[PDB]
């Protein structure tokens, strides 16, 4: 019966202030000892505790971020706000708000610590990216099949989708006709601030001479679509 | 702050298996330890609270134990939906802290990766940059080490790796390593190689090309 949902901007520029709101239903910040906390999860990393605020307005912050974090609440609106100042790309992550139960009470009397040791209900989470990069479509380059990308009667080939922002980008092969053996890697953020990913597929080397291979790349944020044909270099003909 | 060491970091198992994950605290946190399960794209889900209490609605296959500094989460019979990442969290001291996580993937027989290398395209070289890609295809387990060498000079700080999610059909992983150089530096060298280390490989394997030999 408890539901929590985070809302906020998906993109913020470095040095600006980030304001996240948690709206919930199913409980009241008026409940004795109840708490609402925030946890972030940076791309491919572990969970990181940020702060927590309780029904009595008591509150705590991760010590390494206490100068940049501020947490507040409005018990009549069923909301909790987390403010993070002077953000930087290190702050890019998925932010989750969560409910912490108060102790067991008998007719209002606190009788057991037990229930409070965990964050029992989490929100869906909100992804926030901190970057000053401008919107930009990718450039697609071929990863041509060769003797160095062949294994037995099989050959590997692909596309390199480089320098785009922001996420995401979708890739298909031969208009969706080719799916088996395809591997589209999760994008990586380069030191330039632009994303990049590659998509590869293994196919019979005996087909490299007749079958056409085209990767279809689509980057909606910039309205950029590219069809890139990938073929053996002149060396292998 | 209070450090939590979760081990192992990665674990292979099969449906029906019995697994145990441990969490060690740098100091006593009494029973204030919680366990969560996190599936790809989803938020953490509570399993055990207060070290051993089973959260309401959680399957009985999950159990927790410990008190003080050593804790363990146990799944008596592994179910398909249990292949995910698990975390412990201590709520005895501020700041509350989580463990580093323990991923649990589907076990299969060892499989060395097929290593392929791709020199940059002339198309890219014209734009002023050169990306060299090394591909490790369909391997298992997930742990792999890749090193770049340009004319025997180890490359550090100028490459990035990306790994796929375990394949739903053959339970393998694929990894790509991309080395980026400017056109200028790329043309100043001949031999480009990526050395790969993996459990399935008797010894480090090298894949390379010589742009100076045509």
């Amino acid at each position: 019966r408890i539901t929590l949902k985070e809302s906020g901007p998906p993109l913020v520029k470095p040095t600006q202030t980030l304001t996240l709101t948690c709206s919930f239903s199913g409980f009241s910040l008026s409940d004795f000892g109840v708490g609402v906390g925030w946890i972030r999860q940076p791309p491919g990393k572990a969970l990181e505790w940020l702060a927590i605020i309780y029904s009595d307005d008591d509150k705590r912050y991760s010590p390494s971020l206490n100068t940049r974090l501020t947490i507040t609440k409005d018990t009549s609106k069923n909301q909790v706000v987390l403010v993070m100042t002077r953000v930087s790309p290190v702050d890019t992550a998925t932010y989750f708000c969560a409910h912490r139960r108060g102790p067991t009470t008998l007719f209002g009397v606190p009788i057991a610590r037990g229930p409070v040791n965990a964050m029992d209900v989490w929100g869906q989470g909100i992804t926030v990216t901190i970057s000053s990069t401008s919107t930009k479509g990718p450039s697609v380059f071929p990863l041509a099949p060769s003797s160095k990308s062949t294994s037995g009667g099989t050959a590997a080939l692909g596309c390199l989708v480089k320098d785009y922002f922001p996420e995401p980008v979708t890739v298909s092969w031969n208009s969706g006709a080719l799916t088996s053996g395809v591997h589209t890697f999760p994008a990586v953020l380069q030191s330039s601030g632009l994303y990049s990913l590659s998509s590869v597929v293994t196919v019979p080397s005996s087909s490299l001479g007749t079958q056409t291979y085209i990767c279809n790349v689509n980057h909606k944020p910039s309205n950029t679509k590219v069809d890139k044909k990938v073929e053996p270099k002149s060396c292998d003909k | 702050a209070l450090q939590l060491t979760q081990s192992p970091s990665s674990l292979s198992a099969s449906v029906g298996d019995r697994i145990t994950i441990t969490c060690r605290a740098s100091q006593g946190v009494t029973s204030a330890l919680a366990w969560y399960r996190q599936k790809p794209g989803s938020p953490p889900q509570l399993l055990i609270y207060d070290a051993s209490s089973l959260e309401s609605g959680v399957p009985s296959r999950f159990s927790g134990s410990g008190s003080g500094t050593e804790f363990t989460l146990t799944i008596s019979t592994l179910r398909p939906e249990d292949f995910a990442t698990y975390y412990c969290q201590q709520l005895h001291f501020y700041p509350h802290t989580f463990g580093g996580g323990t991923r649990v993937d589907v076990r299969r027989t060892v499989a060395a990766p097929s290593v392929f290398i791709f020199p940059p395209s002339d198309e890219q070289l014209k734009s002023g940059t050169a990306s060299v890609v090394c591909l490790l295809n369909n391997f298992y387990p997930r742990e792999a080490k890749v090193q770049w060498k340009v004319d025997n000079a180890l490359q550090s700080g100028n490459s990035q790796e990306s790994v796929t999610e375990q394949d739903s059909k053959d339970s393998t992983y694929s990894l790509s390593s991309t080395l980026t150089l400017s056109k200028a530096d790329y043309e100043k060298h001949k031999v480009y190689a990526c050395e790969v280390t993996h459990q399935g490989l008797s010894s480090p394997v090298t894949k390379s090309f010589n742009r100076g030999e045509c």
Binding site: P103, I111, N117 | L2, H92
Partner: peptide, 14 residues
């Protein structure tokens, strides 16, 4: 026992 970590809000509750 090291550091001088602050106790959680309910650490002194039975």
């Amino acid at each position: 026992e090291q550091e001088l970590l602050e106790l959680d809000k309910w650490a002194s509750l039975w």
